[PDB]
A paper describes a structure:
HIV-1 and other retroviruses integrate a DNA copy of their viral RNA genome into the genome of the host cell, a process that is mediated by the virally encoded enzyme integrase (IN). Each step of DNA integration, up to formation of the integration intermediate, occurs within a series of stable nucleoprotein complexes (intasomes), involving a multimer of IN and a pair of viral DNA ends. Because integration is an essential step in viral replication, intasomes are targeted by an important class of antiretroviral drugs, the IN strand transfer inhibitors (INSTIs). INSTIs work by chelating the two Mg2+ ions, blocking the active site and inhibiting the strand transfer activity of IN.
Numbering used by the authors:
A (entry chain B), D (entry chain H): 2 to 39, 57 to 139, 149 to 228, 235 to 270
B (entry chain A), C (entry chain G): 1 to 228, 236 to 268
E (entry chain J), F (entry chain D): 222 to 268
G (entry chain I), H (entry chain C): 212 to 277
Amino acid sequence: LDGIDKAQEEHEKYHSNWRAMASDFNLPPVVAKEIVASSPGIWQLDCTHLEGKVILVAVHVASGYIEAEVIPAETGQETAYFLLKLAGRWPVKTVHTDNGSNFTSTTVKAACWWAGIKQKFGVIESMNKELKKIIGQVRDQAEHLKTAVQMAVFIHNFKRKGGIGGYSAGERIVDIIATDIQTKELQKQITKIQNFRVYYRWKGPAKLLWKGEGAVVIQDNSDIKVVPRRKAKIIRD
Amino acid sequence: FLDGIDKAQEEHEKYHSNWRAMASDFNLPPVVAKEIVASCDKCQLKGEAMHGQVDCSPGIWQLDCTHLEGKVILVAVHVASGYIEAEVIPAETGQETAYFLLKLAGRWPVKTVHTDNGSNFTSTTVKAACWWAGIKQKFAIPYNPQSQGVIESMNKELKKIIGQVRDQAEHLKTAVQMAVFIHNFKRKGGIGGYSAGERIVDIIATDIQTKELQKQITKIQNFRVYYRKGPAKLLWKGEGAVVIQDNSDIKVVPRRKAKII
Amino acid sequence: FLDGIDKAQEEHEKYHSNWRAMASDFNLPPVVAKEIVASCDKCQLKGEAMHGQVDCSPGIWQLDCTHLEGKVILVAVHVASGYIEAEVIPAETGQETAYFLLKLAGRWPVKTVHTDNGSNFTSTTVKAACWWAGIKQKFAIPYNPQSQGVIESMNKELKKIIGQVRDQAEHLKTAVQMAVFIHNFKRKGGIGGYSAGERIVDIIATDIQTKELQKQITKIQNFRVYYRKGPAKLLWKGEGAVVIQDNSDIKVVPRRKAKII
Amino acid sequence: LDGIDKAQEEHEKYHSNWRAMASDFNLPPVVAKEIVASSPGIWQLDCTHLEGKVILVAVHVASGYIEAEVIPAETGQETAYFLLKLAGRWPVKTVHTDNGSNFTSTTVKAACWWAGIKQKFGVIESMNKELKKIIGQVRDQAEHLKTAVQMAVFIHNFKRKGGIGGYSAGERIVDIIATDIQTKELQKQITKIQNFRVYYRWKGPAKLLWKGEGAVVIQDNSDIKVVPRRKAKIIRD
Amino acid sequence: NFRVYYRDSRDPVWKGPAKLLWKGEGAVVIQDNSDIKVVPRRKAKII
Amino acid sequence: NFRVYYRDSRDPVWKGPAKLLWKGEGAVVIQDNSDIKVVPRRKAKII
Amino acid sequence: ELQKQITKIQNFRVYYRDSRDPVWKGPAKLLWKGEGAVVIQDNSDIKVVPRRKAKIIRDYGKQMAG
Amino acid sequence: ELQKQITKIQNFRVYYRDSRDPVWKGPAKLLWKGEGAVVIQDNSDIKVVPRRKAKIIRDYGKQMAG
DNA sequence: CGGGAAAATCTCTAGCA
DNA sequence: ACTGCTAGAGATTTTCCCG
DNA sequence: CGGGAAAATCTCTAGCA
DNA sequence: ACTGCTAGAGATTTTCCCG
Ligand SMILES: C[C@@H]1CCO[C@H]2Cn3cc(C(=O)NCc4ccc(F)cc4F)c(=O)c(O)c3C(=O)N12
Ligand SMILES: C[C@@H]1CCO[C@H]2Cn3cc(C(=O)NCc4ccc(F)cc4F)c(=O)c(O)c3C(=O)N12
Ligand SMILES: [Mg+2]
Ligand SMILES: [Mg+2]
Ligand SMILES: [Mg+2]
Ligand SMILES: [Mg+2]
Ligand SMILES: [Zn+2]
Ligand SMILES: [Zn+2]
């Protein structure tokens, strides 16, 4: 409540996003969003071949997290089934395919329509190369190919660590989805309050931002003012 | 009471009367009637009236099989979150179950699986899988489905959903995935008003973040506490209370009679 | 909300999401999400979380059959008291059951029997017996054993005793009578610390005595009460409260605004 | 507590039992028992014959309440079974038999020993005559004899009312057993307290009688004195 | 008026909507397609 | 020392007395004639 | 006469239940008894109870311990 | 430095149970987390809880509402 | 008025199949 | 228009007994 | 500080077979 | 040495909103 001006100065000086502001100055995130205003569901789907069997790989673009299963036939049914599975395990909003015959079937289209996925026809190929490398590294430890494929998916998602932080793809996908959940929660709050108008001290209508226990933060004429709760009236428009 | 006790043992030996009846009829102290009933082997016919509580650590999964329309459905649940992975399988075999489990362990952090003693879960090939993935295997007490109450209730729930959406698929495997999707992302409640997918994300992310933060705090905040003893390692000071860990034993002591060095 | 509602009905039609999920994702008032779920026929899959309560009038008996070691045991319980009459029978037939019931009605006051819908209890000959003895027949809701929870728990208890005393008889009918004896007279507890035999004596004697006493009081204490109405018949005055019966309707009114004539 | 002297006078004047005293003067029954001090479990067992079948009748002597069942053979097994049944339905302390062959069997003796009944080898015959009368009255309403026997047992125990009060045998047996339960309860209380000695005001040991909420009734030198609780000490001897 | 959804008799499949004809403590009487039933309230939902 | 009476595994017959070897929250480990078992505390009585 | 009768009628204990509570409420005093209803008094509170819900005893172990 | 870290660690909510109570106790504040035990604070009461009994979230919907 | 121990009450489970 | 219950085991709270 | 309504919490059940 | 649980329905209590 007091750090609002400090936050405004910091943002004018460094162009900092709402997270770093609501973290360093202890502000409710709707207020930091107002100041700063004053991918996660994207997967790539491609089929690869290896020892005469079809491996249907899905990569989470933001993290490099891999879901691959050996399928029986490069048909539309096996791909629609793989896609329902993926959409039930992770939040999937958009798949990037390559206009192959199976990816364009009416079956996959009905699957995407049921699971609310959007279809859009380079990381996938490098990931196929890494997957094939690990599969060749662990082929002598399984009889069948599907087993070695899952061993490789495991090694890639959890036993290979890279990037800046030194994390693995599972850690990365969990961090990314967590941040994404936060984004939807914040947007839901903003959408919940953005239909209220506040009259304070009476002055003109103000965009409401927060409704704490001891104050009511608002925004009037592109400027943020804190008022005590009893000094203002909140109505829904 | 020596007379009234012997007339009571002789009558219990015939009728196995409860302690109230032998207190009312032989004029006995309730403790003595209870000692009589408590020495009859034939009267020990009842167990405690409690329940245990299942482990709910972040890395424990409960697996079970369930049957529907003649097919076998293997199901896993993340205990802490309620997040499920199901899959229709060809047959309740150890091979298929070991496959399902390798997939799960590659898609999520699985530290421990808990199952009943079905032959597929106890097979030597599910054990080789768990050994490769570094999973700990916990087997229930036999014929105690309450040891797996989470997965067993999830069977209820999965079956309930599959019946709501059965007319939208043709095959059962499709409807099983539809139900896994609906449960993991389209049903909200429990701790945090979440869905199970959001909740597993929160649980796993919280585990990573808290591990990191506490690692840093302990690297920095390095002190020894003497209370009332040895140099107990400090854990948390605040609000006039001190929590320490003396010889791998965690206890809460007030700030008085506790010096920090 | 007109936009958010239609996006919610379209999504429920596919996933049958619960009201919390449609409130969180389409920004809806919980009452509106609940109205959406409440109009989906496919989502009505659960009943209330209560239980009814069985009738426990002094003259109601619950009868059931139970099976042990290949024989049929007919059992009756007096609901108010817990007092049992059991008997091994040749076969679960209406003839045998009508016989058992004539015996019971001649040994005790039986006004009403309550049974499930087993074929022996619903036979036309058990009905002729009940009509001769002036018994009212009450049949449960089919496949609802909870309607007979008293007799069903008595099966538990009878079977439990028969197992304690089975090694003292040779035949099963002997052990059944031994168990009826032990239950009716050698087990104490419940209301009044009684045994079931003492308790049935107390219940029946109390019923007779209270009937007589109240008959006398009403013959003597004859008054009409006007409160707030008509000449309501007085029931009980005392402690500043008046209980009356206006047109077969019993109500408690304070002494104020109530004159006795 | 105050009516103790009135009770003593009434008992010296009319020799009234402890019930009428503890009812008219509002006294705890142990006290009325002390003042007045200063069958229920008896059954008759006999077999009768009728249409070539054996009917085994039991009569409660005090009330005239009847238990009769047609039995298959006048053997010791059927009589031991009838006796276990009766002892499990009613409190049976002593049976009066007639030294017949079945009543003297080792089987009936073992039954009586298990059920704690005492065996002792005119009302039974008059009751057999009344039972036969009712059976002849209701024979046309049943096919078998056992059914008519139970119809007659019913009519006798509940539809025939006689005696002083105008009650039936079922009402009578319930009243008698109720009074008997009261007798055992009182005797149990007397046996529970008769091992205590009270010292009041200190005076010699006194037989304790009651331990109410506001007093302690005792009996010393064949005389009953009420003392307040704090003025006396209760010990167990 | 009320809509009733019920589980009847060993059939684990919920049915309805039926008309509620009578509600007691413990059980309800409904009309499902001219077929009057009696259902325990543990096995019904009234809306 | 304790005496344990227990219902083991689908057998509806209570057995014992066994020695208690270990008691946890939820279950106990007993020794019945050199045969170590693990029983849920819902299915045991310790004396 | 009548007051004796009433004091007698109020010596019977009543155990009873409310329509959604499974536990039996402890002994109350009986004030009136009809065909359908029993009027009791539990802790200076005059409830009406349907007959099917009331267990009316006398408790003989109590009549005799005072 | 360190006090930032501690204030962060105390923003995670904990749901937990006692060894004989089946219901999950509402959100407490996390003070310390070890391998076996979690130290919480529920209504100014510093309990120790075994890990197997604690569900440590962060509630994102609450965090983003203040 | 204070503790200690025992009585009384309360809470909760399996089995009824 | 009908309806879960009962008894034992352990935990927890009340009552009573002597100070 | 007072009610009213809505949110939040609590209580309790079936099914898991 | 391991362990009933989950989600919905209705009832009941809290909280919040404007006075
Ligand atoms: C041959 C494997 C190994 C050995 O035992 C059998 C038999 N069994 C029986 C049930 C069962 O009785 N469910 C009803 C239930 C009752 C109470 C409760 F708390 C939870 C509940 F689920 C199962 O669920 C189950 O998976 C098995 C099983 O797998 N097996
Ligand atoms: C053919 C007759 C007529 C129609 O129905 C069947 C089947 N049935 C089933 C049970 C039973 O499932 N008992 C377990 C139980 C479960 C819950 C509960 F609250 C009480 C309980 F006793 C009985 O007891 C019983 O007598 C019968 C029976 O007689 N019949
Ligand atoms: Mg299983
Ligand atoms: Mg199972
Ligand atoms: Mg039956
Ligand atoms: Mg039954
Ligand atoms: Zn015994
Ligand atoms: Zn629906």
